[PDB]
Design a protein around this motif. Sequence first.
Motif, PDB file in Angstrom:
ATOM      1  N   UNK A 234      -8.510  -4.682  -2.710  1.00 37.35           N
ATOM      2  CA  UNK A 234      -7.883  -4.673  -1.389  1.00 37.35           C
ATOM      3  C   UNK A 234      -8.368  -3.470  -0.593  1.00 37.35           C
TER       4      UNK A 234
ATOM      5  N   UNK B 129       0.864  -1.172   0.000  1.00 39.38           N
ATOM      6  CA  UNK B 129       0.000   0.000   0.000  1.00 39.38           C
ATOM      7  C   UNK B 129       0.906   1.229   0.000  1.00 39.38           C
TER       8      UNK B 129
ATOM      9  N   UNK C 155      -9.594   0.167  -2.125  1.00 38.04           N
ATOM     10  CA  UNK C 155      -9.176   0.395  -3.496  1.00 38.04           C
ATOM     11  C   UNK C 155     -10.064  -0.198  -4.565  1.00 38.04           C
ATOM     12  N   UNK C 156     -10.088   0.434  -5.754  1.00 38.19           N
ATOM     13  CA  UNK C 156     -10.906  -0.065  -6.865  1.00 38.19           C
ATOM     14  C   UNK C 156     -10.412  -1.442  -7.308  1.00 38.19           C
ATOM     15  N   UNK C 157     -11.345  -2.302  -7.702  1.00 36.99           N
ATOM     16  CA  UNK C 157     -11.007  -3.644  -8.161  1.00 36.99           C
ATOM     17  C   UNK C 157     -10.350  -3.591  -9.532  1.00 36.99           C
ATOM     18  N   UNK C 158      -9.456  -4.538  -9.794  1.00 36.14           N
ATOM     19  CA  UNK C 158      -8.770  -4.629 -11.074  1.00 36.14           C
ATOM     20  C   UNK C 158      -9.000  -6.015 -11.667  1.00 36.14           C
TER      21      UNK C 158
ATOM     22  N   UNK D 183      -0.562  -0.325   9.882  1.00 32.76           N
ATOM     23  CA  UNK D 183      -1.505  -0.471   8.776  1.00 32.76           C
ATOM     24  C   UNK D 183      -1.715  -1.950   8.504  1.00 32.76           C
TER      25      UNK D 183
ATOM     26  N   UNK E 148      -3.987   7.456  -2.713  1.00 30.23           N
ATOM     27  CA  UNK E 148      -3.432   6.234  -2.145  1.00 30.23           C
ATOM     28  C   UNK E 148      -3.533   5.206  -3.266  1.00 30.23           C
ATOM     29  N   UNK E 149      -2.638   4.225  -3.269  1.00 30.61           N
ATOM     30  CA  UNK E 149      -2.661   3.206  -4.313  1.00 30.61           C
ATOM     31  C   UNK E 149      -2.276   1.862  -3.717  1.00 30.61           C
ATOM     32  N   UNK E 150      -2.831   0.793  -4.279  1.00 27.40           N
ATOM     33  CA  UNK E 150      -2.545  -0.565  -3.835  1.00 27.40           C
ATOM     34  C   UNK E 150      -1.874  -1.287  -5.002  1.00 27.40           C
TER      35      UNK E 150
ATOM     36  N   UNK F  15      -3.985  -0.091  -8.370  1.00 34.43           N
ATOM     37  CA  UNK F  15      -5.254   0.618  -8.286  1.00 34.43           C
ATOM     38  C   UNK F  15      -5.140   1.865  -7.402  1.00 34.43           C
ATOM     39  N   UNK F  16      -5.557   3.017  -7.930  1.00 32.82           N
ATOM     40  CA  UNK F  16      -5.525   4.301  -7.205  1.00 32.82           C
ATOM     41  C   UNK F  16      -6.898   4.657  -6.661  1.00 32.82           C
TER      42      UNK F  16
ATOM     43  N   UNK G 152      -7.102  -1.160   3.094  1.00 37.78           N
ATOM     44  CA  UNK G 152      -6.153  -1.000   4.187  1.00 37.78           C
ATOM     45  C   UNK G 152      -6.804  -0.185   5.302  1.00 37.78           C
TER      46      UNK G 152
ATOM     47  N   UNK H 103      -8.838   2.883   3.523  1.00 28.82           N
ATOM     48  CA  UNK H 103      -8.677   3.097   2.094  1.00 28.82           C
ATOM     49  C   UNK H 103      -9.084   1.811   1.376  1.00 28.82           C
TER      50      UNK H 103
END
Lengths: 208, 221
Positions: B186, A134, B174-177, B145, A173-175, A161-162, B188, B172
């Motif tokens: 995911x 993350x 996150x958008x799915x891919x 985290x 934030x991005x994963x 993914x942002x 966090x 946070x």
Amino acid sequence: DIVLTQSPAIMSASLGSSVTLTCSASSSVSYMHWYQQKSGTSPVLLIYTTSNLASGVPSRFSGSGSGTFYSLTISSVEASDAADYYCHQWSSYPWTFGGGTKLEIKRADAAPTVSIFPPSSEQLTSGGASVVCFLNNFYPKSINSKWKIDGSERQNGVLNSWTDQDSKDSTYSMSSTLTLTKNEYERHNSYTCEATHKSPIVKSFNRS
Amino acid sequence: EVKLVESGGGLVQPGGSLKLSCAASGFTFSTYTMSWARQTPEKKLEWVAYISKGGGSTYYPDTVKGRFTISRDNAKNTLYLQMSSLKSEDTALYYCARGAMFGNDFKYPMDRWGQGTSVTVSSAATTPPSVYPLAPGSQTNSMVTLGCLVKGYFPEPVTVTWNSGSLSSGVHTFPAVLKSDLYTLSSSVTVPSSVWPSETVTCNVAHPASSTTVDKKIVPR
């Protein structure tokens, strides 16, 4: 089938300044309406009948227009204005919408808080192995993530993914998820993810 | 306040049918026209249907005319959207909206949109997610985290919360891919180091389409 064009698709604004978003139509229309869409919620009405403020909308919002050219003005930009703005007409069937303009808020560069996570024992038992990183609360949006396995960059199998810009601190934030097979994972020990832009923030772990 | 709540979304095969409902409250339903709209996977907004206060008149764009029927049961304070001969172009998050109305020398467009119900038109079968806990590998920080990996599901969407929703700050999601026809997402959450692992932190994941619910505890390695 009136086409509503909103250009630029993405605009950037400084805190406290005024900005104007435009919407041009392929056909003359009597009125234009505007919606605001923030992260995770449905579109909210901001302006109706070209220049009227909807209930609960701050007075820093205003609108004007006629014929095929309309606009939405934000007198002094606030962090909470980070969102997508859409024009809309229902003067003629079919009712239509513009493609939307995203308003980005400028702020100071900020390094991300990086956290790396090894595959869970549970996933390993299923035969898979995902490594997650993350990169939270950074700026600008453009950031580069790099994965290294045993000191060498790994490019394939990475999903990034942002999040939308944050309404409070204007960061992103991005994963980043590195997907490997269990055997692949067990064949190496060092796992690292590096966050760089223009110096980097690096986190890593050893499988053993 | 005015509140509209959609339900009925799901995964349907191309050519199939699905009926959406919208429960309304906070205003006199019977005196208002109502509409449906949708947001495509590309994020484009589209008007879907419009109905008169009594249900006597209905309007639709050519894209759905003849396949979709908007209706209402004022006695139930509910609006409906019957969809048939579904196409991939119909995949979208469908919203219920009040209006549009002509009044007070003003033209009020669709407003008070609900949060929506998702519809996916695909020939692919539903696949439940595998939910994995993300705990630090190695403490070296006053804030820790933690994460949740929701892997390989179809179709969207899934809902993620922390501690049944009691933990909402510092999150946070996150958008799915998409990868190999399956989505991965995911989330966090950052909490004070004095609260985990001395106390419990759990990721609650739901995937309606597959009747899946998972409450994954995050435990230290």
